[model samples]
Target: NQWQHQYFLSYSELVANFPSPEKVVSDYIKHKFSTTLPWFGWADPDNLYFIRFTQSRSNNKSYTGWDHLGKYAIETLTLTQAAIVNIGSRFDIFDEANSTAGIYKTNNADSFDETNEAKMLPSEYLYFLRDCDFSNLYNKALSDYWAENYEKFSTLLQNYYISSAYYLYKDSAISKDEYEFSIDAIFNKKNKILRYYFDVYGYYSSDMFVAMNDNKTMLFIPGATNPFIFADNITDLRDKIKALISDKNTRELFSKHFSLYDRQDGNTYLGVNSMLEQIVSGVVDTNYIMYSNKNIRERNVFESMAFSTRERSFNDGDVIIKSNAEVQRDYALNVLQTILSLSPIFDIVLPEVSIPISLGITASSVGISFDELINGDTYEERRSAIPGLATNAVLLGISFAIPFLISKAEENKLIINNLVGSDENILNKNNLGDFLEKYNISESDIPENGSLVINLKNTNVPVRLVKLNDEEGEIVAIKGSTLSGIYYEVDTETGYEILSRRVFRTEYNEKIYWTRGGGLKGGQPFNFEGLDIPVYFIDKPYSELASSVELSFVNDDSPLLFPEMDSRLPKPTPELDIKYYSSNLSSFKEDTVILMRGTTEEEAWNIANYKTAGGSNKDLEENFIEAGPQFNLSFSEYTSSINSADTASRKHFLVIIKVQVKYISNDNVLYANHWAIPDEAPVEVLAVVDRRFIF
Candidate 1:
């Protein structure tokens, strides 16, 4: 069950092993379709949008630009669907069938980097509150907060009280009653400064404006307009801001407040950047943020969190990550686009029924009700319903024809007035109750308001009250959902607000299979061009949104959310008539060797990343091209056998080389291995390239 593999000893070896990005992409396409199917979307799972590479590669000579593009047979097993499946799951057949994707009621991994989150033990969490260690990783992190990460984790410190004493001061303002000063509290205050400068959503934070000058980041409070003089640091910057405002009250407020990051005692704003850049540039990695806990000198957590804010790509230059909002916004619009796709069908449909159904309905109704409207034997009966018939006709006509004539102006707007009955008080209170009930939140545990708890079912999750006038003025509550969100409740002018916002769903980024593109990887700026296969974007990535007991990776005949590959091949003219390449495995695992047709040894290494289609590849080849993306010679089984004395100690070895591929077509998956030498018979060879013998 266990085996030893290889580990490259140095960056040099790793880089030598690294395939170029273009080659990596090429092999990815070949490897992808060889053994996989279309990745289904949540909205609609069955509608496959793939062009068969085997089909296209052969048909190219005849169809060229047109047929290769592909045509489609257009088609979330939703909540209701889930309910039916849940019922089916109650039986043995359901259980066995469900084994196909496996039950996810109990998860193997928690998202939001839950497993990786800093573990502050019960004793240690309180210690940070007692003796203020400025160098504590957590404490240092406060002063060293990244300007960009402020909004992403702004609320991470919400309800953040170590021993119930340190408040963030985001809501506290500048006053003594709000806080009694302590050096420990200064850590929180520094975080407050970080939060203040980075507040994209807060209005109260408009009190300060920040800019960068002369290696220092400067702060300009709202009151300073014309006296836009730059200060050496925060000292006179604060003084001038107070002077220009001319408000005695504002000056008094400023006079009582703490200084900024660039005070004489500290140039932390500039220093913080320098320290992190040093870390980013590979300085002090061997040094810990703190060397001792009982002195625990843990590695990587602080460094990782600090570095997480930066995307270290682009050949040593920084590639900053975009806010999650862009992705969420894109997803929402993609959804809207999917909805628009149905509009054409509706356009044709509406016209077809606009008059036919209307006239048909008019005739059917009048024909059925004519006895009362006109044909009744008694004139009193006929006169009684004449006005009603005309009004009904007008209403029916308006209903059908109006939909046909109106210009598109987004009628999908939520006219949110009530989800409760008139008798049940449709205000936020009732709304909150239903909201809580829908998610199975415990009423008592709700802070009267909140982690991140799994919301796949009505479990132990509760709405948490995070913000407050401490219950005197305003408050905020946040709840969790697996479908992607932290649902919010807040104070509005009316009373309380139910679902006022949806914080970006943080749990989904890590939840996918490696083969299926389910999770992400963390590399230490390594030299190896590692293979990380994320889920393919074939249709919509039908993620979590199950109605009747749904979970991640459930592949039911389940419809899309509503739900809800390769290139190359040409005929088999044997390249060299079943000729074997010169590569072998030195380890016991090496019996047959992979041999993708290639010119150079490095190209051979790159090509080997792709595997055979397993069944057939003798489609359309007649020549050996020198430059496009390479492909697998059809897969040949490797089984060792040498029983007879005549055979001596040698057992035949199989050879399958997936040589390196390059793109000549500008298309990503262009294969050049068009020969049936291996497909018909994967012949064995005497000598092989022992790839392990690298110097």
Candidate 2:
């Protein structure tokens, strides 16, 4: 028991010394397939001499061929060795079989044929033992046979290694408990050996069983045969698994076990002494812990310490600083020196000092002569000594006094122009009153009943003043005139009047009045005849109608009322008649009498003859032709007496005249003429012959 314990301890240590099988396998595959295979022209079909060699033994039969063959053999041997080491290190099949000898060991070990192979060796080792022909003669014969049948030998070897390594792990000699412990340990290993190795070397086909009882706790790589289990917590393991499966390059380069240098380089491992000391001293930084947990490099300590101190100064407490008394004293002196240097007055009175000289030496050490410092001999020289000071002073005084003078001048002009005055002086006394008095106006002159007409000088249109009545009047509503050349106005009850060319109405007043020519005046009721016409008192004169009744009255046709009289008129009276009757006869006169008269026997007879000569004289008679001087005298007296009376007293009289007419046929006819007169008579005796004289 003691020996066994010692042996087990030694074995455990030995097993610990072996690198993780998954890591070795992953590195082996990466090194062979990715890093080296491409260099060996694996992708170039033309460079595949091995396939040619497999097809025929005659191909590549020289030492160079053998050298290539030996090189591949060595590579294969290295991979096989790695695989064996990985499997052995991760599992303890020998110990397990030893512990359970009845189940694993055979009764007759020497006679262990293929049937008894499982009892002699675990299924993983059985295939290698059964196929391996490692006797001295067999090895010699194998080399000879390969050189003879090189194609078959190489093809067989290639198949043997590729397929053999995976089968070696099946049907393990380890007990269920042992296998469980090994699997758990392999999964929990810090380096993640199995996961890394399988990520690079394991095949992904369903033919491979990676987990115990087919639970699939482990995963296989796409083309490799080894199975690998995760060695991290669920989340991290998932992340790593996804990364491995997704990125082909990551799978190829995966490392199962991290080296010491790797851990240190990644800053994942905190030094034991350093960590413990920080914890003991209560000085461990949370950043350090975080960086370690996440496997990231920690920040520089000195830089962090300085930053922390700076932050505390701003955020934690007040900071004390030295007073700037000395600096302020120097700065104030410098400023004063600069001011004095630039001052015109100071430059004249004091010696000019160089800034550098003043800074370097004492004031007494300045070498300017007293005469030179105060060198003003003449009046111009004294003035020149102050440079622009005297000019500036004069300009400044002028600048100060100019605005005041200008303001005073303006005030004077205002006073002279009578613009600056009190309300009493301006309106009641000087300006307004004077203007009103010049125009012969006073307070009483302002119109109360009507608008004032202001005939302004040099203006054709006079401005009329009217009362607004404090907006009591409504707005004037007017419309355009439908009657050409005429405009009208509308009146409202509120005294609002509208003037327009067209007629419209107001709701307040039902009656709408129209005016022609001039606009209506507002606020006054106009009277025309017996009718009351409300008028808007606009500035111009307007002939207004009281209402539609008045409008109809003024526009009514006279012929409609006196049709008979109107028909008695000529269609269009003669121009001469129109002049004589003044167109009034269009309703009055209906005369066919001749318009001429005669005075004496021959004169009257000539006139009568001329008047009657145009007649046909179908009938003729010589009946009467009489006139008396006394009768004419009596008629004249009567006309003079009526003419001397009032015009209203003048009476209408009829006079009948008898005449003998001689027609163009030489026929004699007596004609009687009648005339109506209004207190007017001819100076001589006259006779009028009618057209019916030839009766």
Off by over 4 Å in 1: 1-337, 340-475, 481-486, 490-695
Candidate 2 residue lDDT tens string, 1-695: 12112212222222222222223323443444465444422222111111001111122423212211221111111222212222233235433321211111122232212332122122223233233322222222222222222222222222222222223334442234433433442223343222211111111111111222222233322112222332323334444444443433332122111111111111322332333234335564322221211110111111111111221221111100111111211111110121111111111111221221222211211111112212223223433432222212221111222222233333433433342111111112345455455546554655443334444332222233222222332122222221111223322111111222222221113333332222232212211212221211111111233334533443211221122322222122222442244234344333321222211112222222332221111222243121111111111111111111111111111111222111101001110111212111221122221110110
Give the whole-model CA lDDT for all candidates, comma-separated: 0.22, 0.23
Give me the runs in candidate 2 sitting further than 4 Å from their true place: 1-446, 457-460, 467-695
lDDT of 2 at 294: 12
Angstrom error at residue 20, model 2: 99
At residue 41, give the lDDT of candidate 2.
23
Best by TM-score: 1
**Relative to the unseen true structure, what is the C-alpha lDDT of residue 198 in candidate 2, on a scale of 0 to 100?**
14
Distance from true location, Cα of 633 in model 2, Å: 31
